[PDB]
Amino acid sequence: YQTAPFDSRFPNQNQTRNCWQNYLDFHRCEKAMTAKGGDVSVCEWYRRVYKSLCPISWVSTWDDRRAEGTFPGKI
Amino acid sequence: QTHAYHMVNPSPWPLTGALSALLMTSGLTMWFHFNSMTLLMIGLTTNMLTMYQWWRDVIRESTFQGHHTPAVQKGLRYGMILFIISEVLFFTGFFWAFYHSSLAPTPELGGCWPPTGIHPLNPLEVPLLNTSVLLASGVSITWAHHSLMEGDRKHMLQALFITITLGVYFTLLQASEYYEAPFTISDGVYGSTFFVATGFHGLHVIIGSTFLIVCFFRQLKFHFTSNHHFGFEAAAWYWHFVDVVWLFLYVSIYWWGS
Amino acid sequence: MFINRWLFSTNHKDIGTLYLLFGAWAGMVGTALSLLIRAELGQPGTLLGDDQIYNVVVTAHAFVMIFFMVMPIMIGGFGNWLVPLMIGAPDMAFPRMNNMSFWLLPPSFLLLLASSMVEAGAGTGWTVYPPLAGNLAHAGASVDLTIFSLHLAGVSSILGAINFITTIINMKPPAMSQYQTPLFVWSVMITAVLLLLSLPVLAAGITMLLTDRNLNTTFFDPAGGGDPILYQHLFWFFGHPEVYILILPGFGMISHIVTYYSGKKEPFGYMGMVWAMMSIGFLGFIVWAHHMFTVGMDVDTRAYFTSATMIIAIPTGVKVFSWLATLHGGNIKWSPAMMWALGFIFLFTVGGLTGIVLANSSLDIVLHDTYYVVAHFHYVLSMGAVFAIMGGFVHWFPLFSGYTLNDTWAKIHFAIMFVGVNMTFFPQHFLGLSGMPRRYSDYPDAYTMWNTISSMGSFISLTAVMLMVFIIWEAFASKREVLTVDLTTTNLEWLNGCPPPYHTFEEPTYVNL
Amino acid sequence: ITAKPAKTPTSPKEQAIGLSVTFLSFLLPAGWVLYHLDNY
Amino acid sequence: FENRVAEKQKLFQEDNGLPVHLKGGATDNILYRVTMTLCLGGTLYSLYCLGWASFP
Amino acid sequence: MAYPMQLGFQDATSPIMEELLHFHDHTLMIVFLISSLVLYIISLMLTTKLTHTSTMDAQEVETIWTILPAIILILIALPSLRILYMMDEINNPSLTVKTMGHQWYWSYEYTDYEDLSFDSYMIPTSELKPGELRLLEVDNRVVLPMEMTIRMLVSSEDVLHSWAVPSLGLKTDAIPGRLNQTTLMSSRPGLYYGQCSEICGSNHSFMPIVLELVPLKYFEKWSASML
Amino acid sequence: GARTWRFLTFGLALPSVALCTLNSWLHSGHRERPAFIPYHHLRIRTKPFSWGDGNHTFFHNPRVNPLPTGYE
Amino acid sequence: GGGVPTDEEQATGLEREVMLAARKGQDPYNILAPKATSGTKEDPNLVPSITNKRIVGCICEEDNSTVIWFWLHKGEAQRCPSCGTHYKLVP
Amino acid sequence: YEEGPGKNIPFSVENKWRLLAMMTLFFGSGFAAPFFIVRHQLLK
Ligand code: HEA
Ligand code: HEA
Ligand SMILES: CCCCC/C=C/C/C=C/C/C=C/C/C=C\CCCC(=O)O[C@H](COC(=O)CCCCCCCCCCCCCCCCC)COP(=O)(O)OCCN
Ligand SMILES: CCCCCC/C=C/CCCCCCCCCC(=O)O[C@H](COC(=O)CCCCCCCCCCCCCCC)COP(=O)(O)OC[C@@H](O)CO
Ligand SMILES: CCCCCC/C=C\CCCCCCCCCC(=O)O[C@H](COC(=O)CCCCCCCCCCCCCCC)COP(=O)(O)OC[C@@H](O)CO
Ligand SMILES: CCCCCCCCCCO[C@@H]1O[C@H](CO)[C@@H](O[C@H]2O[C@H](CO)[C@@H](O)[C@H](O)[C@H]2O)[C@H](O)[C@H]1O
Ligand SMILES: CCCCCCCCCCO[C@@H]1O[C@H](CO)[C@@H](O[C@H]2O[C@H](CO)[C@@H](O)[C@H](O)[C@H]2O)[C@H](O)[C@H]1O
Ligand SMILES: CCCCCCCCCCO[C@@H]1O[C@H](CO)[C@@H](O[C@H]2O[C@H](CO)[C@@H](O)[C@H](O)[C@H]2O)[C@H](O)[C@H]1O
Ligand SMILES: C[C@H](CCC(=O)O)[C@H]1CC[C@H]2[C@@H]3[C@H](O)C[C@@H]4C[C@H](O)CC[C@]4(C)[C@H]3C[C@H](O)[C@]12C
Ligand code: CUA
Ligand SMILES: [Xe]
Ligand SMILES: [Zn+2]
């Protein structure tokens, strides 16, 4: 892993949804693996991609909203 | 003159209207920023005085003085159509804002439409009733038009009264809707698009209803002939415009956007 | 009698005179703002010591020149004076509504000068983009007063558009088809259609900005799901038609001036000139996103906007070549108005061609938000509009006033102005190519030489403006009353004398089929 | 264009006065503000 | 109601030199003065407000 | 960076800026030629005592006046659009860097592996080291590997800004709530300068961009030292 | 003619309004309000409103419109 | 049911004058385009006027975009300076 | 209303020197205004 590869779902200059989708994907997968006592290494691809693409302040705001119960995406 | 056009007497109403615009805008500024409604209420008063006296004079010039030859009437027809076109393009801007927001919902909304936490109105309840009301009022205003062309005073007044009653019913239903809505103008872009688009539409319904009421009183005073009644035609065109904007709002915001 | 005539007017000529006076006054304001801009940039470092005030000066400069100088002069002034005369009509369709289009402009201007005097002004650019124009980065009344100034100007021009379209469609002689109306009348009709369709979209967008600033809407605020780029689309959907609004009446005046001073009865290729203006008007609605090539839109969208934008060169070239073919074989009269019109054709062509450079999205990445854009529009808009206005002013001044100008003084004025504008704007191309951003109060040291020259140019144009006022004074001071003009057989606006009586065409023209 | 002789001809001297007053009306107020920018 | 348009046509066509905004009689004069006083006074008040708002 | 008395573009540092230089040369030749032809024909129309003032037939000449411009526009559009599609063309970046605009400075995030981030402020004129450039120097430069495809993601934490580096052919608006992507590839080491290119208030003139392009080994040493 | 348009008014248009009125009146009961969640994209306050305490929307309904801090 | 006034009953001022003149096939307010004669010296176009001169616009050939404007004076017929068509003023 | 040269304007051209005063005040006020607004903002 060097950086997030080209993703044909997000081929344009606006990459907002690429960051968002990988953040959701990581947290949905982390919930599925924890809720069984499973293994979060399965979620690693999504973690590396969102960490690469997403502004630190977006990740930090989303994290705070998940802990507050105000995150508006479905996890 | 040996042309058929109207040389208008020098008039103060353009200047009083221009100053009413200054007072309403400086008044909104002084309400939003300086905690005061004074200028705004003066501007609203001078705006209503200006519109009353200007359109009174147009009635004096036409019904009482005979200045509306066929050539003048043709100009007024073009003027009202061009005015309605400018109002269509105004609404187009709000529809553009609605489709921009709803077709590409941002992550702050939950990346979905309607946004997370928004409970839209059921479009089959009061919004469907509002649709039947304005469509019915388009039928009754057409009955009024035909009664007037056929020389039938009683049925013109009955049809126009029914049209106005339906306009008022829409306005009271929308007022009630506004109060019962569990979302507000501050509920993000969903509230913003809903209240600004339907709010400008409700303003046009009140304007349209007011125009129909002017036509009702002019008809009671025998101003219209079976052949010459442009104020009635203009109010009917404006009323159909208000109906058609509603149908677009209903399909776009209430139904497709729910 | 004075208040009845000048405050309660229902006369197209008097209202045209009010618009010309208003526009000339606004031009002094806009010129003063332009000289403050070039004084700040005239040497490296800070002059005003306040970059918020610099940004307010730049913003006001543009609003004054567009909304209070060009549109009032071209449409309110020449339009109201000439359109009824050129179609033999006794006035405008809505002579009282016409007076309200005029009287909305002083209040509009007052709201703009209030924006600049309260808080720290609206230092937004004339585009007023959020979030800079929002209630956090521009807290206070300044931006709201700018929005209201635009509302009043917007209502003035929408009602004026309704009046011109109705007048031109409904008030010609019954034998005169639309294909027997003069090109200036076509240019006003088409401008009025663009105003009618574009200003309501601007009104929707700045109303959304008002509600985001004051009613807790979020049309342009990502926190509520809004999008700053939506404002840009609404603004430029108006803004591109607006630049064609600013030049089209100038195209009409240039057609009349070139025809007149070539000693011709008619412009070359009349139906081609009508086609070209209608084509430019139509295409002007489908190109707006060339103002947005750096905001992150899709490559195919950039390809479309590049291609559509370049198409406008075709009808535009037909007009340029048609003006040249009107000169062809003329008995040329080297009047000052002809000099303005020839200056127009050349300077408009240069600016139009830098437009075609900018149309290329790829190159636009490097030229966007640089002085190359500033150079482009000061050629095509600033010099185009101004040269067309000065040509129209010196041509029709004797019609409006009954008095002649001193032609030698008017030629001196032209010569000074031609030197000044070229010395001011030509070097801005170099500044843009070499990467100097627009909307800057100061610049890296490398950009000093061309900024210095540009600022020296701005003072030469000031000398021309001061001379222009003197020349107008000398004409009213000397009172050389017009007797005759040539070519009245193809210039109906002259046929009632100079100035024409308060009421003209009480008895309409006789035109048979 | 043809015109009657000037009803009230403006001599070279009258033009120098007109030009001078015009230029001063532009230059003096702006000059006063720009000269005092330090004091501001 | 009764059709009294002919009586209003006679009033508004009387050869008395009045402009149409005043031809109805003394009530027109009163409404005009109220309108123009509120407009001019309101405009003077808006300038005062500008003077106030122009300083901290 | 620009130099005194410069007329044209900064020397190209990237292959796409090279393509833009060659495309501008082609287009400028056409601008010159058309400008010159219009001025020439004006002088030609104005320099003869010969006259023809009767009605002229326009139909034949208007074919020439529409077809020749249409051909010229196609000859500009073909290479313009080839370059447009080249700067969109899928590439595999080896590095992603974020930049966030602020009133009035840039921050940079290198979060491919480490959480590295820092702010980048204009050096005031009173603090410039001898020989440093007024309005262009920053305290913390954007360290990047040369000869490698880099993905830059641009956004804002407040108002609009625009992240520009003329010598690389780059300009991408910085919009809050939006992540705009561009590709960066430097053919050379060195320092490459740019300036905020969307009006963002009083200090718009004073929040520059400085890239520092170094061989990959030195980029990796710099990254490692940052832990 | 007028006779036809009156026929449509009374025979189709007003009967439609009567049926939609019945539909509306039958579904008019108060819905149970949802749990309050202080979502950051809702109850926006960038400037106080220019009426009341600055925190109430113009047609605020206590039963169904929570404030930023929740139901009154 | 009646009760709506007709134009015949209630039109007034210039509207009524236009209405009454159209019933008689007259056009005192210049609503209609006049039909040209052959325009020869024997058959000139007859230009009504309430005064001793009136502006004539001559569309010399159908579909000409250029209209030729001139004052036509009381007295001997005048000719369009572009096509030579004759016009005679009839006060 | 009065008709003819110098009579179709809201300002008098009866006296060229009074005209020069009025034109000077008219265009001079417009040109001065931005200098005095800048001064006003700087003195804040
Ligand atoms: C009078 C006003 C006016 C006119 C008429 C135009 C005309 C054109 N403009 Fe310009 N423009 C502005 C005023 C105007 N513009 C303003 C004010 C801005 C900046 C707004 C802001 O950001 O503040 C601007 C900005 C602007 C941009 C955005 C640049 C950026 O911000 O990065 C672009 C992009 O495509 C554009 C292109 C054009 C084109 C292609 C034309 C065409 O219509 C030109 C067509 C004319 C010709 C081409 C010349 C004549 C033709 C011939 C002689 C025939 C032969 C020619 C060829 C074969 C090429 N202009
Ligand atoms: C019609 C529009 C127009 C006109 C005429 C002008 C005229 C001038 N402009 Fe510009 N300008 C703009 C429109 C115009 N401008 C716009 C839209 C912007 C962008 C704002 C933004 O970024 O948001 C701009 C920005 C702009 C900038 C860039 C600021 C920056 O990016 O920081 C500069 C820099 O030099 C400039 C300079 C000038 C100068 C020196 C003049 C003049 O001094 C040139 C000489 C012309 C005159 C002196 C006019 C004379 C006319 C009259 C006085 C009327 C007479 C009336 C009658 C005869 C009836 N203007
Ligand atoms: C019943 C049917 C219709 C009712 C009409 C509305 C009544 C009051 C206002 C009148 C003006 C309406 C026009 C549209 C403007 C803005 C918003 C109006 C829509 C409305 O009334 O929305 C209300 C908010 O009003 C608000 O903020 C307060 C709004 C009051 C101040 C508005 C000021 C804005 C004026 C803008 C002027 C621009 C004009 C454009 C000119 C263009 C020219 C080119 C919604 O209530 P809420 O509590 O949030 O949610 C309901 C919760 N139970
Ligand atoms: C409670 C109120 C609060 C809200 C306030 C806002 C304003 C509300 C106003 C409603 C509009 C009332 C208009 C009344 C016009 C009456 C004059 C009229 O109707 O005039 C007629 C001409 O029409 C004409 O000018 C046609 C004139 C058409 C006017 C068009 C009106 C639409 C105006 C909209 C206002 C702006 C909306 C924009 C909002 C952003 C006269 O000709 P006839 O009818 O042929 O008569 C002659 C015959 O009798 C002869 O036999
Ligand atoms: C933020 C707050 C800012 C808002 C400020 C609003 C601005 C100004 C205050 C408005 C004051 C209006 C007073 C009444 C104006 C009535 C105009 C009218 O009705 O004009 C008529 C013509 O326009 C016609 O018909 C058809 C056109 C009728 C137009 C009615 C006026 C509407 C004004 C607002 C419209 C904006 C449009 C919305 C789209 C963006 C009549 O023309 P006249 O020349 O009078 O007479 C001709 C004679 O032959 C008649 O016998
Ligand atoms: C001949 C013409 C007659 C002119 C008379 C003008 C009419 C009103 C004059 C008094 O001015 C008012 O005074 C109130 C204070 O004394 C203000 O309260 C305002 O401030 C309150 C704050 O307590 C808020 O509730 C409201 O914005 C508002 O009432 C109110 O806004 C403002 O209009
Ligand atoms: C962008 C357009 C600007 C173009 C520049 C105009 C050209 C200069 C015009 C003259 O302006 C004046 O200059 C004087 C200086 O020459 C100033 O006197 C100032 O300086 C004098 C001498 O130093 C003192 O005696 C005075 O008291 C003092 O006010 C005076 O105020 C100012 O009106
Ligand atoms: C006939 C032509 C028109 C004539 C115009 C007449 C103008 C009337 C002047 C009234 O002045 C008012 O004074 C109030 C008290 O001084 C202000 O109250 C407001 O400001 C107060 C400051 O004490 C606050 O308590 C509140 O926001 C509010 O009461 C209010 O803004 C202002 O309008
Ligand atoms: C009695 C009177 C006659 C009208 C006349 O010829 O002057 C009639 C004719 C039409 C009547 C109106 C229409 O029937 C419609 C309405 C019917 C409602 O029941 C009363 C109000 C209402 C608005 C009526 C008022 C009044 O009774 C009117 C105006
Ligand atoms: Cu940041 Cu301009
Ligand atoms: Xe507007
Ligand atoms: Zn003829």
Numbering used by the authors:
A (entry chain U): 11 to 85
B (entry chain P): 4 to 261
C (entry chain N): 1 to 513
D (entry chain Z): 1 to 40
E (entry chain W): 1 to 56
F (entry chain O): 1 to 227
G (entry chain T): 12 to 83
H (entry chain S): 3 to 93
Reproduce text from the manuscript describing this model:
pmcCytochrome c oxidase (CcO), a terminal enzyme of the respiratory chain, catalyzes oxygen (O2) reduction coupled with the proton pump, generating a proton-motive force across the membrane. Mammalian CcO consists of three mitochondrial DNA–coded core subunits (subunits I, II, and III) and at least 10 nuclear DNA–coded peripheral subunits. The electrons from cytochrome c are transferred through CuA in subunit II and heme a in subunit I to the O2 reduction site, which consists of heme a3 and CuB. Cytochrome c oxidase (CcO) catalyzes oxygen (O2) reduction at the heme a3–CuB site in the transmembrane region of the enzyme. It has been proposed that the hydrophobic channel that connects the transmembrane surface of subunit III through subunit I to the heme a3–CuB site is the O2 transfer pathway.
(1) Fully reduced CcO was treated with Xe under an anaerobic environment. Using these crystals, we measured the X-ray diffraction data at 1.8 Å resolution. In the analysis of the anomalous difference maps, clear anomalous peaks were observed at eight sites in CcO in the fully reduced states. The Xe1 peak was in the O2 channel of subunit I near the interface with subunit III. The strongest Xe2 peak was between the two benzene rings of Phe67I and Phe68I, which protruded into the space that branched from the O2 channel in subunit I. Xe3–Xe4 were in a hydrophobic channel extended to the molecular surface on the intermembrane space side. Xe5 was in the cavity formed by the transmembrane helices (helices X, XI, and XII) of subunit I at about 8 Å from the matrix side surface. In the reduced CcO, Xe6 was in the cavity formed by the redox-dependent structural change of heme a side chain (hydroxyfarnesylethyl group) and the transmembrane helices (helices X and XI) of subunit I. The anomalous peak of Xe6 was much lower than that of Xe5. Xe7 was in the cavity formed by the terminus of the heme a3 side chain and the transmembrane helices (helix IX of subunit I and helices I and II of subunit II) at about 8 Å from the transmembrane surface. Xe8 was near the molecular surface on the intermembrane space side formed by the transmembrane helices (helix III of subunit I, helices I of subunit III, and a single helix of subunit VIIa).
